[PDB]
PDB file of C-alpha atoms and ligand atoms in Angstrom:
ATOM      1  CA  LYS A   1     -22.113  30.403  -6.330  1.00 35.77           C
ATOM      2  CA  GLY A   2     -22.120  28.018  -3.693  1.00 32.08           C
ATOM      3  CA  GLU A   3     -25.056  26.136  -4.868  1.00 36.07           C
ATOM      4  CA  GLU A   4     -22.971  25.213  -7.856  1.00 35.97           C
ATOM      5  CA  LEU A   5     -20.679  22.761  -5.846  1.00 35.07           C
ATOM      6  CA  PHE A   6     -23.671  20.828  -5.217  1.00 33.60           C
ATOM      7  CA  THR A   7     -25.462  19.771  -8.608  1.00 38.99           C
ATOM      8  CA  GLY A   8     -23.668  16.228  -8.774  1.00 36.99           C
ATOM      9  CA  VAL A   9     -22.546  13.372  -6.377  1.00 36.80           C
ATOM     10  CA  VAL A  10     -20.366  14.804  -3.671  1.00 38.73           C
ATOM     11  CA  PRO A  11     -17.861  12.649  -1.831  1.00 37.10           C
ATOM     12  CA  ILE A  12     -18.039  13.032   2.036  1.00 36.88           C
ATOM     13  CA  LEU A  13     -15.838  12.837   4.914  1.00 37.13           C
ATOM     14  CA  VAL A  14     -16.366  12.916   8.753  1.00 36.89           C
ATOM     15  CA  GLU A  15     -14.440  12.737  11.520  1.00 37.31           C
ATOM     16  CA  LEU A  16     -15.325  13.097  15.315  1.00 35.85           C
ATOM     17  CA  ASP A  17     -13.364  13.621  18.104  1.00 37.07           C
ATOM     18  CA  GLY A  18     -15.490  13.217  21.556  1.00 36.69           C
ATOM     19  CA  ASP A  19     -15.255  12.919  25.515  1.00 34.42           C
ATOM     20  CA  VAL A  20     -18.455  11.831  27.323  1.00 37.20           C
ATOM     21  CA  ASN A  21     -17.764  11.858  30.665  1.00 38.80           C
ATOM     22  CA  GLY A  22     -14.093  10.786  30.169  1.00 43.05           C
ATOM     23  CA  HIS A  23     -14.986   7.975  27.945  1.00 41.49           C
ATOM     24  CA  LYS A  24     -12.567   9.053  24.539  1.00 44.20           C
ATOM     25  CA  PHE A  25     -13.463   8.290  21.278  1.00 43.19           C
ATOM     26  CA  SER A  26     -13.500   8.951  17.714  1.00 42.79           C
ATOM     27  CA  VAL A  27     -15.680   8.274  14.607  1.00 40.42           C
ATOM     28  CA  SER A  28     -14.526   7.989  11.049  1.00 41.73           C
ATOM     29  CA  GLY A  29     -17.302   8.396   8.536  1.00 45.41           C
ATOM     30  CA  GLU A  30     -16.984   7.805   4.264  1.00 45.87           C
ATOM     31  CA  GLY A  31     -19.616   8.555   1.701  1.00 47.43           C
ATOM     32  CA  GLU A  32     -21.335  10.807  -0.563  1.00 48.32           C
ATOM     33  CA  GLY A  33     -24.066  13.118  -0.985  1.00 49.71           C
ATOM     34  CA  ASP A  34     -26.455  14.326  -3.557  1.00 49.82           C
ATOM     35  CA  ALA A  35     -28.452  17.424  -2.688  1.00 51.44           C
ATOM     36  CA  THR A  36     -30.313  17.123  -6.190  1.00 51.18           C
ATOM     37  CA  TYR A  37     -32.438  14.415  -4.500  1.00 53.53           C
ATOM     38  CA  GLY A  38     -31.493  15.611  -0.686  1.00 51.60           C
ATOM     39  CA  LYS A  39     -29.439  12.057  -0.107  1.00 53.90           C
ATOM     40  CA  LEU A  40     -27.150  11.221   1.737  1.00 52.51           C
ATOM     41  CA  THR A  41     -25.394   7.852   2.448  1.00 52.94           C
ATOM     42  CA  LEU A  42     -22.608   6.901   4.736  1.00 52.52           C
ATOM     43  CA  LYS A  43     -20.753   4.473   6.387  1.00 51.17           C
ATOM     44  CA  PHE A  44     -19.357   5.697  10.235  1.00 52.10           C
ATOM     45  CA  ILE A  45     -16.790   3.525  12.000  1.00 54.41           C
ATOM     46  CA  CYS A  46     -15.668   3.999  16.004  1.00 55.64           C
ATOM     47  CA  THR A  47     -11.846   4.047  15.297  1.00 55.30           C
ATOM     48  CA  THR A  48     -11.290   3.404  19.078  1.00 54.90           C
ATOM     49  CA  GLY A  49     -12.904   0.468  19.954  1.00 52.09           C
ATOM     50  CA  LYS A  50     -16.698   0.153  21.327  1.00 55.69           C
ATOM     51  CA  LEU A  51     -18.699   3.519  21.156  1.00 58.35           C
ATOM     52  CA  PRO A  52     -19.330   4.724  24.697  1.00 54.39           C
ATOM     53  CA  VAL A  53     -22.866   6.376  23.409  1.00 52.62           C
ATOM     54  CA  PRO A  54     -25.417   4.716  21.461  1.00 51.40           C
ATOM     55  CA  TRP A  55     -24.801   5.547  17.700  1.00 51.64           C
ATOM     56  CA  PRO A  56     -28.272   7.269  17.135  1.00 49.58           C
ATOM     57  CA  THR A  57     -27.603  10.261  19.889  1.00 50.32           C
ATOM     58  CA  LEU A  58     -24.309  11.111  17.203  1.00 47.88           C
ATOM     59  CA  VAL A  59     -26.483  11.232  13.986  1.00 47.58           C
ATOM     60  CA  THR A  60     -27.330  15.062  14.201  1.00 45.57           C
ATOM     61  CA  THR A  61     -23.495  15.867  14.877  1.00 45.19           C
ATOM     62  CA  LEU A  62     -22.214  13.523  12.199  1.00 46.75           C
ATOM     63  CA  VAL A  63     -24.023  18.199   6.683  1.00 50.03           C
ATOM     64  CA  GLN A  64     -26.813  20.305   5.927  1.00 50.36           C
ATOM     65  CA  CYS A  65     -25.603  21.569   2.662  1.00 51.05           C
ATOM     66  CA  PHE A  66     -27.116  18.341   1.250  1.00 52.24           C
ATOM     67  CA  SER A  67     -30.498  19.384   1.937  1.00 55.95           C
ATOM     68  CA  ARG A  68     -32.651  19.533  -1.069  1.00 56.92           C
ATOM     69  CA  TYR A  69     -34.001  23.063  -1.377  1.00 57.22           C
ATOM     70  CA  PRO A  70     -36.592  23.391  -3.963  1.00 58.20           C
ATOM     71  CA  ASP A  71     -36.051  25.733  -6.969  1.00 57.05           C
ATOM     72  CA  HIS A  72     -38.670  28.374  -5.493  1.00 60.57           C
ATOM     73  CA  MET A  73     -36.912  28.794  -2.045  1.00 60.60           C
ATOM     74  CA  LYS A  74     -33.225  28.588  -3.249  1.00 65.01           C
ATOM     75  CA  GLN A  75     -32.596  31.934  -2.194  1.00 65.88           C
ATOM     76  CA  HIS A  76     -33.032  30.666   1.202  1.00 66.20           C
ATOM     77  CA  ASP A  77     -29.991  28.082   1.457  1.00 69.40           C
ATOM     78  CA  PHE A  78     -27.582  29.583   3.627  1.00 67.88           C
ATOM     79  CA  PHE A  79     -25.355  26.131   3.672  1.00 66.71           C
ATOM     80  CA  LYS A  80     -24.839  26.016   0.173  1.00 69.04           C
ATOM     81  CA  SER A  81     -24.155  29.874  -0.164  1.00 68.85           C
ATOM     82  CA  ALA A  82     -20.967  29.437   2.783  1.00 72.23           C
ATOM     83  CA  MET A  83     -19.118  27.000   0.528  1.00 74.73           C
ATOM     84  CA  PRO A  84     -16.517  26.416  -0.138  1.00 72.91           C
ATOM     85  CA  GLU A  85     -15.141  28.407   2.599  1.00 73.92           C
ATOM     86  CA  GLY A  86     -17.791  26.550   4.934  1.00 74.45           C
ATOM     87  CA  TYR A  87     -19.373  27.233   8.181  1.00 72.98           C
ATOM     88  CA  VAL A  88     -19.013  26.569  11.792  1.00 71.12           C
ATOM     89  CA  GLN A  89     -21.780  24.905  13.354  1.00 67.28           C
ATOM     90  CA  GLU A  90     -22.187  24.568  17.223  1.00 68.20           C
ATOM     91  CA  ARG A  91     -24.603  22.829  19.264  1.00 70.24           C
ATOM     92  CA  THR A  92     -25.872  22.115  22.702  1.00 69.93           C
ATOM     93  CA  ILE A  93     -27.808  19.091  22.682  1.00 64.63           C
ATOM     94  CA  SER A  94     -29.756  18.575  25.813  1.00 64.74           C
ATOM     95  CA  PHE A  95     -30.996  15.093  27.154  1.00 63.62           C
ATOM     96  CA  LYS A  96     -33.912  15.504  29.413  1.00 63.48           C
ATOM     97  CA  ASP A  97     -32.967  14.188  32.875  1.00 60.82           C
ATOM     98  CA  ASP A  98     -29.677  13.342  31.551  1.00 61.04           C
ATOM     99  CA  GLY A  99     -26.223  15.000  30.087  1.00 63.12           C
ATOM    100  CA  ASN A 100     -25.469  17.228  27.854  1.00 60.95           C
ATOM    101  CA  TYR A 101     -23.360  17.636  24.392  1.00 57.20           C
ATOM    102  CA  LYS A 102     -21.727  20.313  23.273  1.00 55.22           C
ATOM    103  CA  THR A 103     -20.250  20.385  19.483  1.00 55.54           C
ATOM    104  CA  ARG A 104     -18.273  22.318  17.053  1.00 54.56           C
ATOM    105  CA  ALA A 105     -17.819  21.483  13.975  1.00 54.16           C
ATOM    106  CA  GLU A 106     -16.055  22.564  11.035  1.00 58.95           C
ATOM    107  CA  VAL A 107     -17.850  22.020   7.150  1.00 54.22           C
ATOM    108  CA  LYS A 108     -15.850  23.091   4.258  1.00 54.80           C
ATOM    109  CA  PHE A 109     -14.782  21.568   0.983  1.00 53.38           C
ATOM    110  CA  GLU A 110     -11.073  20.009   1.165  1.00 53.09           C
ATOM    111  CA  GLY A 111     -10.445  19.750  -2.661  1.00 49.86           C
ATOM    112  CA  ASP A 112     -13.597  18.336  -3.955  1.00 48.37           C
ATOM    113  CA  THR A 113     -14.734  16.622  -1.102  1.00 46.14           C
ATOM    114  CA  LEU A 114     -17.071  17.773   1.969  1.00 45.33           C
ATOM    115  CA  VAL A 115     -15.697  17.308   5.105  1.00 46.62           C
ATOM    116  CA  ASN A 116     -17.325  17.339   8.772  1.00 48.20           C
ATOM    117  CA  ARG A 117     -14.688  17.797  11.377  1.00 45.40           C
ATOM    118  CA  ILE A 118     -16.228  17.805  15.012  1.00 44.75           C
ATOM    119  CA  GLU A 119     -15.333  18.100  18.506  1.00 43.28           C
ATOM    120  CA  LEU A 120     -18.088  16.519  20.885  1.00 47.60           C
ATOM    121  CA  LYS A 121     -17.935  17.191  24.564  1.00 50.14           C
ATOM    122  CA  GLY A 122     -20.469  15.331  26.758  1.00 51.08           C
ATOM    123  CA  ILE A 123     -21.047  16.220  30.648  1.00 50.14           C
ATOM    124  CA  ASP A 124     -23.145  15.168  33.571  1.00 49.76           C
ATOM    125  CA  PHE A 125     -24.489  12.170  32.067  1.00 49.12           C
ATOM    126  CA  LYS A 126     -26.034   9.373  34.337  1.00 46.16           C
ATOM    127  CA  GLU A 127     -23.606   6.155  34.732  1.00 40.27           C
ATOM    128  CA  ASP A 128     -26.665   4.212  33.873  1.00 38.43           C
ATOM    129  CA  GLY A 129     -29.050   6.515  32.243  1.00 38.14           C
ATOM    130  CA  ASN A 130     -30.494   5.893  28.504  1.00 36.31           C
ATOM    131  CA  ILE A 131     -27.387   7.364  26.961  1.00 42.53           C
ATOM    132  CA  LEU A 132     -24.717   5.518  29.238  1.00 40.37           C
ATOM    133  CA  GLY A 133     -27.019   2.334  29.925  1.00 39.26           C
ATOM    134  CA  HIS A 134     -27.354   1.786  26.460  1.00 37.72           C
ATOM    135  CA  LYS A 135     -31.012   1.818  26.397  1.00 36.01           C
ATOM    136  CA  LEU A 136     -31.564   3.526  23.154  1.00 32.87           C
ATOM    137  CA  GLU A 137     -32.974   1.644  20.183  1.00 33.85           C
ATOM    138  CA  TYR A 138     -30.867   1.179  17.025  1.00 35.75           C
ATOM    139  CA  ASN A 139     -33.345   3.324  15.006  1.00 31.87           C
ATOM    140  CA  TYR A 140     -34.412   6.892  14.191  1.00 31.25           C
ATOM    141  CA  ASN A 141     -37.531   9.082  13.991  1.00 27.91           C
ATOM    142  CA  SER A 142     -38.639  11.776  11.386  1.00 25.43           C
ATOM    143  CA  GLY A 143     -38.770  15.152  12.256  1.00 26.65           C
ATOM    144  CA  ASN A 144     -38.396  18.669  11.177  1.00 23.68           C
ATOM    145  CA  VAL A 145     -35.475  21.243  12.204  1.00 24.33           C
ATOM    146  CA  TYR A 146     -36.365  25.054  12.123  1.00 22.66           C
ATOM    147  CA  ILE A 147     -34.031  27.328  10.933  1.00 22.33           C
ATOM    148  CA  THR A 148     -34.172  31.169  11.226  1.00 21.95           C
ATOM    149  CA  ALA A 149     -31.586  33.859  10.223  1.00 19.68           C
ATOM    150  CA  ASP A 150     -29.140  35.445  12.787  1.00 19.52           C
ATOM    151  CA  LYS A 151     -27.973  38.465  10.906  1.00 17.72           C
ATOM    152  CA  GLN A 152     -25.913  39.637  13.457  1.00 19.67           C
ATOM    153  CA  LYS A 153     -23.526  37.016  12.976  1.00 19.05           C
ATOM    154  CA  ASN A 154     -24.328  36.811   9.459  1.00 14.96           C
ATOM    155  CA  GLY A 155     -25.623  33.027   9.792  1.00 19.27           C
ATOM    156  CA  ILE A 156     -28.388  30.746  11.123  1.00 22.36           C
ATOM    157  CA  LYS A 157     -29.722  29.440  14.237  1.00 22.07           C
ATOM    158  CA  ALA A 158     -31.879  26.193  14.531  1.00 23.91           C
ATOM    159  CA  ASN A 159     -34.045  24.968  17.468  1.00 22.84           C
ATOM    160  CA  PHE A 160     -35.687  21.187  17.223  1.00 22.50           C
ATOM    161  CA  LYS A 161     -36.282  18.318  19.027  1.00 25.33           C
ATOM    162  CA  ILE A 162     -35.140  14.633  18.760  1.00 27.46           C
ATOM    163  CA  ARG A 163     -37.021  12.247  19.963  1.00 28.54           C
ATOM    164  CA  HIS A 164     -34.603   9.014  20.619  1.00 29.64           C
ATOM    165  CA  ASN A 165     -37.097   5.731  21.204  1.00 26.58           C
ATOM    166  CA  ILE A 166     -36.365   3.911  24.430  1.00 29.24           C
ATOM    167  CA  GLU A 167     -36.514   0.020  24.362  1.00 31.05           C
ATOM    168  CA  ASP A 168     -39.169  -0.034  27.019  1.00 33.46           C
ATOM    169  CA  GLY A 169     -41.650   1.826  24.727  1.00 33.50           C
ATOM    170  CA  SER A 170     -40.694   5.580  25.989  1.00 36.39           C
ATOM    171  CA  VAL A 171     -38.766   8.342  24.685  1.00 33.87           C
ATOM    172  CA  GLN A 172     -35.682  10.082  25.324  1.00 32.23           C
ATOM    173  CA  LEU A 173     -35.770  13.733  24.267  1.00 31.42           C
ATOM    174  CA  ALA A 174     -32.607  15.520  23.229  1.00 29.92           C
ATOM    175  CA  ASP A 175     -33.005  19.312  22.706  1.00 31.52           C
ATOM    176  CA  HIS A 176     -31.252  20.832  20.127  1.00 31.10           C
ATOM    177  CA  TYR A 177     -29.716  24.643  19.661  1.00 31.09           C
ATOM    178  CA  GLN A 178     -27.818  25.302  17.134  1.00 29.57           C
ATOM    179  CA  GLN A 179     -25.931  28.008  15.371  1.00 29.18           C
ATOM    180  CA  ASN A 180     -23.768  28.595  12.098  1.00 28.90           C
ATOM    181  CA  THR A 181     -21.493  30.993  10.912  1.00 32.54           C
ATOM    182  CA  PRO A 182     -19.652  31.102   7.843  1.00 30.90           C
ATOM    183  CA  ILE A 183     -15.754  30.687   7.874  1.00 35.59           C
ATOM    184  CA  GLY A 184     -15.439  33.026   4.853  1.00 32.44           C
ATOM    185  CA  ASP A 185     -15.675  36.747   3.813  1.00 33.09           C
ATOM    186  CA  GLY A 186     -17.942  36.499   0.924  1.00 34.18           C
ATOM    187  CA  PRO A 187     -21.909  37.210   0.972  1.00 34.64           C
ATOM    188  CA  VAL A 188     -24.203  34.478   2.286  1.00 37.80           C
ATOM    189  CA  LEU A 189     -27.727  33.872   1.947  1.00 38.73           C
ATOM    190  CA  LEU A 190     -29.772  34.490   5.566  1.00 38.39           C
ATOM    191  CA  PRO A 191     -32.962  32.786   5.242  1.00 41.28           C
ATOM    192  CA  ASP A 192     -36.746  33.880   6.070  1.00 43.04           C
ATOM    193  CA  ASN A 193     -38.050  30.977   8.379  1.00 41.21           C
ATOM    194  CA  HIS A 194     -37.946  27.653   7.380  1.00 41.21           C
ATOM    195  CA  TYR A 195     -37.798  23.954   8.224  1.00 43.65           C
ATOM    196  CA  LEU A 196     -35.618  20.894   7.138  1.00 44.63           C
ATOM    197  CA  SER A 197     -37.808  17.660   7.020  1.00 45.47           C
ATOM    198  CA  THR A 198     -35.788  14.650   7.802  1.00 43.29           C
ATOM    199  CA  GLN A 199     -36.053  10.952   7.353  1.00 40.70           C
ATOM    200  CA  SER A 200     -33.438   8.638   8.655  1.00 39.54           C
ATOM    201  CA  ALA A 201     -32.480   4.841   8.275  1.00 39.80           C
ATOM    202  CA  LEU A 202     -29.858   3.204  10.198  1.00 38.48           C
ATOM    203  CA  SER A 203     -28.357  -0.234   9.597  1.00 34.10           C
ATOM    204  CA  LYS A 204     -25.213  -2.413   9.746  1.00 35.57           C
ATOM    205  CA  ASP A 205     -22.963  -3.867   7.319  1.00 38.98           C
ATOM    206  CA  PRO A 206     -23.265  -7.513   7.476  1.00 35.92           C
ATOM    207  CA  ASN A 207     -18.990  -7.731   6.698  1.00 37.47           C
ATOM    208  CA  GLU A 208     -18.293  -5.278   9.140  1.00 41.03           C
ATOM    209  CA  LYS A 209     -16.889  -6.525  12.763  1.00 41.36           C
ATOM    210  CA  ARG A 210     -15.883  -2.656  14.064  1.00 45.41           C
ATOM    211  CA  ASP A 211     -18.396  -0.982  15.814  1.00 44.59           C
ATOM    212  CA  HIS A 212     -20.187   0.998  13.199  1.00 45.80           C
ATOM    213  CA  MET A 213     -23.488   2.675  11.764  1.00 45.57           C
ATOM    214  CA  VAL A 214     -24.843   2.504   8.013  1.00 48.60           C
ATOM    215  CA  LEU A 215     -26.979   5.993   7.418  1.00 53.05           C
ATOM    216  CA  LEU A 216     -29.028   6.878   4.774  1.00 54.27           C
ATOM    217  CA  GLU A 217     -30.995  10.059   4.919  1.00 55.62           C
ATOM    218  CA  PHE A 218     -33.155  12.224   2.850  1.00 51.83           C
ATOM    219  CA  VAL A 219     -33.912  15.792   3.687  1.00 52.46           C
ATOM    220  CA  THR A 220     -35.947  18.316   2.241  1.00 54.22           C
ATOM    221  CA  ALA A 221     -36.095  22.161   3.220  1.00 52.19           C
ATOM    222  CA  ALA A 222     -39.968  23.352   3.384  1.00 51.61           C
ATOM    223  CA  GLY A 223     -42.195  25.786   4.854  1.00 51.99           C
ATOM    224  CA  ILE A 224     -41.907  28.598   2.595  1.00 51.95           C
ATOM    225  CA  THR A 225     -44.872  30.338   1.174  1.00 53.07           C
ATOM    226  CA  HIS A 226     -45.126  29.912  -2.847  1.00 51.97           C
ATOM    227  CA  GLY A 227     -47.934  30.958  -5.335  1.00 51.09           C
ATOM    228  CA  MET A 228     -47.245  28.181  -7.708  1.00 52.06           C
ATOM    229  CA  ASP A 229     -50.391  26.774  -7.140  1.00 52.61           C
ATOM    230  CA  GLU A 230     -51.977  29.404  -9.492  1.00 51.18           C
ATOM    231  CA  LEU A 231     -49.897  27.743 -12.252  1.00 49.49           C
ATOM    232  CA  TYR A 232     -52.179  25.057 -12.604  1.00 48.86           C
TER     233      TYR A 232
HETATM  234 MG1  LIG B   1     -41.238   1.118  20.500  1.00 49.53          MG
END
């Protein structure tokens, strides 16, 4: 099954093409994931020049198959179950009092590398709002991603809120609506309601002159009832 592909360190490639309000840009990322520890280490580079939106607003778009699912809830890991053929991941990201991103990605193996290929379209952003005015801090909050089954499309949906810190002490909300559907025809795991608990750390490469983001993340699945407390 697909979970077998994730028992070790897996190389990752991420490629994004974006248009936000007519600002065209591309990001390329490289690194690896080790789902055993729910761990991602990636460096992203804007290959077209300066990124026209803040790096933190792209973190959710830029591989949920690297979540650590505890053994007792392994039967709820849709993401690995769709591999290697992969899945389509679509989102609408609604920035409160501002514009929205619509994203379409395909996440799949290309040989033994896990690839996330994404098209991002941003519209109706305010020229000097928090996004296009670059008023968001270079940091990121921990949070939960709530997953539910979508049996009609043999997939999942997710609903969650990202809170981006604004440089003035306030918060820019980014409401996320997500739908994933397998690319292949084999059976997948359709989960009970549960969530992914995330933590993310953003940094810079001291030797890198291009516009870039270094990202370290841990993601753990939770929210499924077990009775293992009785064992002890
Ligand atoms: Mg603050």
